[PDB]
Symmetry: D2
Subunit: 458 residues, 4 copies
């Protein structure tokens, strides 16, 4: 069978292919080849612009334009030609070199310096810079914008549900109340920390020849400061310079990038699970679309499939991201080639994540808080007032406060009247007694609401 | 950009797409849908053949042929129709049901029992059986055949290199010799163990309604023995029966299946790495063709790129296989849907492995043992004879045998002459002294050759 | 600070030390050394009993008893002596050899064949056999017994709760009912599958010299069939023979063993989580004793801390088990020593699991099903009867059955009365209408109870 | 059997127990209890020092001293008492509370405010701050110093071997030369990046009650600004404040801490492997100790067991660190208790790492570079000069330079005379021809030496 979204082995290009279309122009073989062409061309232009390198005179305006067009117009047809050449070379980057030499052959000025294409370069000089550009593009144009959508989305939920009381669950058991909004706020805050970290991750690049010592460069141009030339070229591409490497850029920054993405994903997994649970408890109703089918056999079903889809894909994302993070930075001696094939999977780990981000956003858009249920549940759990009562008792020196409340509530059902009766028998100033009799599980929410309102201050 | 092998995000469908084409008809959405249709059709066919279920009379030959054709000729166009219907249902299995209902509408016999399609079934009854069929097919038609090629390949190398001496390396250091063939035999033996295990793994399936208690089945047909019905149906598909489940088949067998593939892949990583190193030591030269480029900058390079490609892909395979193996069997209460999207990746872990198997076979085809280097290295490591000498001394009661050889060789360079002189000073019977003076690093290979020759007698 | 359970870095030897005491005599350095001594002693004993090896005459009863005593009475003091000798050798197995040599010196018979201790052996010949003995002992005396307790425990719950109705949850939502007992039975069945698998795993061992070719053995005794000698010795230890290896036993069986324990642990995590949730839903209340504190701040709390402790430890167990399973079988060339230090952790992964098994059993002992809540919840979810109604409608040819019930219940609240009214308007034979009007969420449990009663007939 | 280093199940407390003794006072149950006592006491002191909280008057000098002594003198006997109390409570932190109440009972001033011990606190307020102190102490006093030793060690090797030529290996094959020192320098640089990152990781702490909303605090003291009180207390402990949490501190920073430690460990694994290989190639000899045994059967053996031990333990370390990093940040709703038992393993992942750090240092101390072998090997690989020759040809416009050199060397043995003969036939200016004939694989090292000398500038 020919490849199509229906026949694709992986769901990243298959069932969810339309959810990650932007990655097809970045992490695919086409994307890799596109970026390699960009790097090769930029290298030739720097050599030409470098006065000390007389063998490569400055290019005329039209020659520079011809070169820039090769970069900007790079097509699948161009990539297909490179692969055709690769059939002969069985070496992808050499095929890129030969492809570029073919392209400039018709332009005398360029053909003249044809043998300067890839001059003194090793394949990894081209590959690592290509990977850097792929990752930088992915982060700045795709990943961060989804993270911002998720963060803004959670904040909106926090504000929207700021004052909606919730019977908290610790150890899965009824506990001291909070508000739906506050529980949303906690997640936004965590996501924000990771967003800052991802944005601060360095994206490194290098260019220094075969084993990282500019051997070939120096042999031909011993008078040129290639260490300076290297830093200038890498930074000219918008990449941060990595001065010490072997044949390959070590890949530590890729682990740094993926580790933070995995942390964010983990926070999202936690969120997907919690909401799945709130929906199970009926604290949230789900918006329904006319025509849709919840269950093939149970007509009444309305399921949180978006949160579940996201949860599953986040696990897959982390499995791939984690493997790359831990495996890439280890390479035998000056390097073994196992990282090449692995690096063709940078978009895979990212892709599962993007699919999950969209699913979560989709699930969030269908949330309908159920205040009635939330409040009704709280009204059936007056035992949660045992904490404040004992704490107040502690304040006013009443003996064994915690112990007395434990005797009253642990393993015992106690309603409002019962809790109220206990308070009345306490040796406390009327003012405090009345203050205690005035609280309910629904209003025993502490600083929850204000916590939500102050989030914007962090 | 439209999807093509060039724009595909994953190299399983991209760069290596042509290496795993067989999986496109199995693990993809098209494959999933095709098997779902097969299961649905067979379910309807069993209901018809069941005399006690009179509302669905036995189907005549032409109707059975029409149903069989739906299964056999299932096309991408058919899959597209289901996807079109799914746009409305937002439920894939329900779209399959509607698809089939549309298909039988033109056959009165079949159209008359239209509402019996998916009768009493829950989506997972169809899904789990499809996954089982997908995995069984992949194992018997794809995985095992590659494993047999690797095993036979290693065995061929074992025989071909049965008597070629090798300076063994323990802790990376020169050690007691072996033969290239013996080192290959060890790997083939480990591979065979996993082969037998994978083949013995159970591929389970179930069919029992919404939560596993045949609730719906019994509500409509209380006089029918659905437990028996279930076992017959699952086994009729060539799948092994799993009588106890919630809404989903628990997936334990998937972990069992993936755990053995991972063990096999691990053995292969070990192999890829060892050969990469033997090539690094120049114990093997590499066959290459004119035109091929080793390095873009170093024209003299000839690299073991096939073994490296395999090694990298095996790591990826195991990472995906292991995630599925450990995550799938955990599902909240009667099931949470997180396993659905994950199960659409059964072929991904398998795909990375297939790519690796082919790369290794390619690498193996290019190996050329370098007898000259192997022997020359052995002739510069006569210190390895310290072990046999001390051992012989132990036998004949000579004092501090091991200790004496350690003082003589640890941290010291000793050639054939120096080792010979030492043996001469030993208080051993002439015959034993001669035997020791007759051995060399190259012939101090123990039972290596016979071990290789006897491999065929195992497994 | 001196080491004590209070200062121990790891909770396996610290807080939970008393929960895994049996492992101290197996996987610790003391245990490793004890088994090494056992293997060394048995090796010497076989050499003596082998008539062809005349330099080591058969041992008389008292000498055999003295050797057996070294093995049987091996103490921490003996272990300390070896560690003392190791301070000089910087090689543990060599220290064991010297230890034994010192021990036999007082027995002329044994002292006379002193240099035959460790004869022709490489350290791994002793190590791998010790690991095999450690794992076999742990499996047969520790792991399986806990697994049997869990399985029997789940089966007891299954029987005890066989007929207690439960509103099932799929996607976390109210679904077709089952029984508490049926949900327990499902787990017991999965556990039994892994139990059989773990019991069937092969525990392999080898003994063949420095690199696996009996080089040293053949150099001294070329007329002896060491391949046969090897198989006899390994099997005499109750271990299964692995004829092909490098310096180390490849460790594939360790992965096979650990892969099944991990699958079992995964099933248990699934269980711990489900029960944690059933407790959260108040389907089960928890037994607690006076004096116990649930929360330091919320006096009303009663938490399922036992299940939570188990769940956390199972994750830890699998993480260690999986690392060993995937890393151990890869060793550079004839072996690199990275597996030695790692193999000192065989008991760690097992320890986390043992802690978890005991915590779960403790949690189970405190469960008290809450029939009132389970039934009350079911009585507020009559919408689950939409499935059986539509299914019956399908049987009797009523049009758009599923679709009609969806419009009636999806996103809508429907009580017993509303469901009853709907059934009355259906064009079905009186008998079928009555049957539908007679069912309730609580009795719509299908074959749940019989499934539980038939569990005993499986496995 | 009773617990001893010989009977310990885990080698962290067993065979290598003496290698991690410092962790016994930090991550053990004793350490956890010690820190919990510290937090509880500090909390009581802040309440006393807080003027607005009149029910807890400022403490006299001797009372404060008595409290400080409880913290500073905390012993195993004290910890044993807490565990004895825990037998009754089956709740560790409550046992700590009761233990402290017992300790102050003899001091009237303290006994007077006995019920203010743990006032309004939830166990996790104490636990998370304890974990923060454990991790901060471990990083600043143990981990970073080992990393600094390793970094300084690699730098010393770099300087010591700065000019020692090495036949590089890419794909495991003879490649463009470098120097032993440069290969050491690359590793030091990578380790330094992680050191900076680990040092910059935030160590967070919180204190806000049952579910994070100061519910109990406000119920008793509605006039006190508990949000300010919280930030002050956490920062007073030297911990960074985490304002938004549920019952537990989310643990994201722990993942951040462990992820960077794992990255460092991975770099070290790569190093352990490379040196193991250099030793296998005989580029490094190993120092030998009189009396030691390399092999029980092969008398001549001298093995790099220290690097191997380190490699094995680094893998174990990462397995544990990774599990904690990915599992801890996920907790059901306001929290499930699975993280408590897991957090008792913070020292385990760290312990394996420390054992490995020491083993690597030990292995490094035994390295003896073998210049003779290194140089002899290079002198047998004149084919590596094919790169510079073709590059020079490229510079001077000689047709198909790379192609001509490939024909000459790919799959062919070419010695100095052969390479020299090829150069003589080139149409290049004598000056360049002589420059090429003057190089050897040993001096074709590019900027390697200078790269090493400039490391100190980064
Ligand atoms: N040392 C190297 N650096 C960069 N590319 C290489 C190196 N060695 C081989 N290659 C080529 O890199 C490509 C790797 O392909 P793949 O394994 O599919 O990722 C192959 O086309 C090789 O010919
Ligand atoms: N409980 C369930 N069992 C089987 N399929 C379901 C269930 N709940 C929802 N679905 C459907 O299964 C599909 C899951 O899609 P995906 O997440 O992409 O794997 C969706 O089309 C859902 O409508
Ligand atoms: N090739 C080998 N086979 C078995 N033991 C070895 C080997 N090489 C070194 N050893 C010893 O094995 C022990 C490994 O200790 P450890 O790294 O703590 O597990 C050390 O005492 C070494 O002297
Ligand atoms: N929600 C909670 N927060 C803090 N501690 C708890 C909580 N629930 C139970 N505990 C106690 O925490 C301890 C956990 O012990 P372990 O599982 O061994 O780490 C037990 O002593 C419990 O009684
Ligand atoms: O193609 C390169 O740039 C390098 C190849 C190699 O080192 O083998
Ligand atoms: O589609 C089904 O078969 C089941 C759906 C559900 O349980 O929600
Ligand atoms: O101690 C041994 O048995 C082997 C040691 C080695 O191969 O180095
Ligand atoms: O002990 C505590 O602080 C909290 C306990 C709980 O939430 O259950």
């Amino acid at each position: 069978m020919e490849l199509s979204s229906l026949t694709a082995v992986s769901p990243v290009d298959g069932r969810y292919g339309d959810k990650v279309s932007a990655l097809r122009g970045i992490f695919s073989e086409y994307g890799l080849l596109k970026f390699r062409v960009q790097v090769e061309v930029r290298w030739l232009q720097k050599l030409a612009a470098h006065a000390a390198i007389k063998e490569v005179p400055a290019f005329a305006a039209d020659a520079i334009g011809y070169l820039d067009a090769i970069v900007a117009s790079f097509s699948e047809e161009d990539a297909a030609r490179i692969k055709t050449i690769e059939r002969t070379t069985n070496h992808d980057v050499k095929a890129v070199e030969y492809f570029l030499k073919e392209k400039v052959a018709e332009i005398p000025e360029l053909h003249a310096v044809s043998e300067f294409i890839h001059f003194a370069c090793t394949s990894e000089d081209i590959n690592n810079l290509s990977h850097a550009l792929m990752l930088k593009t992915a982060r700045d144009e795709v990943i961060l914008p989804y993270w911002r959508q998720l963060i803004d989305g959670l904040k909106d939920l926090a504000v929207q549900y700021r004052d909606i009381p919730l019977l908290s669950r610790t150890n899965g058991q009824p506990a001291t109340p909070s508000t739906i909004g506050k529980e949303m706020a906690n997640v936004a805050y965590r996501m924000e920390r990771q967003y800052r970290q991802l944005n601060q991750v360095e994206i490194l690049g290098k260019i220094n020849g075969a084993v990282g010592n500019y051997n070939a460069h120096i042999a031909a141009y011993p008078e040129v400061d290639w260490h300076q030339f290297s830093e200038e070229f890498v930074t000219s591409l918008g990449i941060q310079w990595n001065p010490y490497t072997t044949q390959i850029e070590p890949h530590d920054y890729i682990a740094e990038l993926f580790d933070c993405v995995a942390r964010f994903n983990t926070i999202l997994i936690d969120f997907d699970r919690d909401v799945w649970g709130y929906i199970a408890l009926n604290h949230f109703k789900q918006k329904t679309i006319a025509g849709e089918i919840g269950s093939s056999t149970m007509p009444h079903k309305v399921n949180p499939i978006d949160f579940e889809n996201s949860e599953g894909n986040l696990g897959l994302s982390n499995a791939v991201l984690q493997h790359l993070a831990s495996k890439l930075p280890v390479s035998r001696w000056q390097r073994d080639l196992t990282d090449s094939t692995v690096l063709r999977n940078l978009g895979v780990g990212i892709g599962y994540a993007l699919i999950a981000y969209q699913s979560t956003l989709k699930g969030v858009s269908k949330l309908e808080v159920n205040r009635d249920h939330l409040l009704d549940e709280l009204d059936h759990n007056w035992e949660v007032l045992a904490e404040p009562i004992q704490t107040v008792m502690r304040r006013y020196g009443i003996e064994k406060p915690y112990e007395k409340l434990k005797e009253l509530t642990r393993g015992k059902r106690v309603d409002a009247e019962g809790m109220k009766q206990f308070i009345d028998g306490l040796a406390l100033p009327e003012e405090e007694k009345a203050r205690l009799k005035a609280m309910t599980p629904a209003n025993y929410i502490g600083r929850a609401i204000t916590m939500v309102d102050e989030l914007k201050h962090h």
